[PDB]
Design a protein around this ligand. Structure first.
Ligand SMILES: Nc1nc2c(ncn2[C@@H]2O[C@@H]3COP(=O)(O)O[C@H]3[C@H]2O)c(=O)[nH]1
Ligand SMILES: Nc1nc2c(ncn2[C@@H]2O[C@@H]3COP(=O)(O)O[C@H]3[C@H]2O)c(=O)[nH]1
Ligand SMILES: Nc1nc2c(ncn2[C@@H]2O[C@@H]3COP(=O)(O)O[C@H]3[C@H]2O)c(=O)[nH]1
Ligand SMILES: [Mg+2]
Length: 329
């Protein structure tokens, strides 16, 4: 295998980890911020899987090896890191806890794993960069470049000794869950969000949306994945602002690399144009975040708290633009 593998101490440590009792009820909520509980992150994921699919959904030892190896294969980049992975998985958990009867046991397992692995081995570089500089990854994966790589790395971890949490599924269900995971991870490519949201809006408005129609179902799951991947915009303001700093730290590092190679970066990736960030955020919320959560709320109403939170943060960015912001840290 070309993947890094967890050590015995790492996975055995997770197997023995116990979440504090009082914290459990907080994990059920949409706005929960895992930020202040780093040592507990892998344990929070185990808990979410168990509450969603039962204590025997996966053999515990294999699940712990899988989680700790996934952690080891996320890089030390500013944003697309291990913290992000667990944050996205938690949003999926909150959505599922409020819509669990609409999804099968197989889909719940697949989606939680897809979320934990959706940015596996991210290098801190965008698909735009990889394609622009003809990186080998872009030759191998023409579109949704990094996302196809993330799925390939996910399959690779399952192949590590004692890491295949899905081997006990029948051969048909095994193939089915890998497909759910592949489509879900690919769905996190924002380039695909615009078309997917437009199609879902048409399906919903014409009254043709049918959750039992597999093609419709795949699209709903795709929008759910987008919603989870974008969830930093659904946290309490200070948490959302702190995360934005990480997002931009990564964007700016990419812009720095571009300048070194003679290609000027777009303003968003230019460290010297940080004054444009508030307006950029307004643009992003208006073009992507708000419509995403608006459509998600239409199709799955219990997800409304995410939309409400996004609207609140849009209002905070507007305050920044008007020069009304309080103190930021
Ligand atoms: N590179 C690599 N190392 C492995 C593999 N399987 C086991 N190891 C390593 O072997 C080590 C044995 O002791 P450990 O502390 O459990 O940590 C283990 C890993 O670091 C593998 O497939 N690839
Ligand atoms: N490369 C590597 N494999 C290890 C290590 N410890 C255990 N292994 C396992 O031993 C196996 C020997 O055959 P393999 O196909 O190379 O796959 C290897 C791993 O599954 C280690 O430190 N490095
Ligand atoms: N592209 C983009 N992403 C943003 C912006 N503000 C926040 N984000 C989030 O940061 C993420 C960075 O990686 P991404 O996969 O491109 O998805 C991005 C969004 O979820 C913005 O202005 N542009
Ligand atoms: Mg990604």
């Amino acid at each position: 295998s070309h993947m890094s593998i967890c050590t015995s101490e790492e996975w055995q440590g997770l197997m023995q980890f116990t979440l504090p009792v009082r914290l459990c009820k907080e994990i059920e909520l949409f706005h929960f911020d895992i930020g202040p509980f780093e040592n507990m992150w892998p344990g929070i994921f185990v808990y979410m899987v168990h509450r969603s699919c039962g204590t025997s959904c996966f053999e515990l030892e294999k699940l712990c090896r899988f989680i700790m190896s996934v952690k080891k294969n996320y890089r030390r980049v500013p944003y697309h890191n291990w913290k992000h992975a667990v944050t996205v998985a938690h949003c999926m958990y909150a959505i599922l806890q409020n819509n669990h009867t609409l999804f099968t046991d197989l889909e719940r397992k697949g989606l939680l794993i897809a979320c934990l692995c959706h940015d596996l081995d991210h290098r801190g570089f965008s698909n735009s960069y990889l394609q622009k500089f003809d990186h080998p990854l872009a030759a191998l994966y023409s579109t949704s470049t990094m996302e196809q790589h993330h799925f390939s790395q996910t399959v690779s971890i399952l192949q590590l000794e004692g890491h295949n949490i899905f081997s006990t599924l029948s051969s048909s269900e095994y193939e089915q869950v890998l497909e759910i995971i592949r489509k879900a991870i690919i769905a996190t490519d924002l380039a695909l969000y615009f078309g997917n949201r437009k199609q879902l809006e048409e399906m919903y408005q014409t009254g043709s949306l049918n959750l039992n129609n597999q093609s419709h179902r795949d699209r709903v799951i795709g929008l759910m994945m987008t919603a989870c991947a974008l969830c930093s915009v659904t946290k309490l303001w200070p948490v959302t602002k702190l995360t934005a700093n990480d997002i931009y730290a990564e964007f700016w590092a990419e812009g720095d690399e571009m300048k070194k190679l003679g290609i000027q970066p777009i303003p968003m990736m230019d460290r010297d144009k940080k004054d444009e960030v508030p307006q950029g955020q307004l643009g992003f919320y208006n073009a992507v975040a708000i419509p995403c959560y608006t459509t998600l709320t239409q199709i799955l109403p219990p997800t409304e708290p995410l939309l409400k939170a996004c609207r609140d943060n849009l209002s905070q960015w507007e305050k920044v633009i008007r020069g009304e912001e309080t103190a930021t840290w």
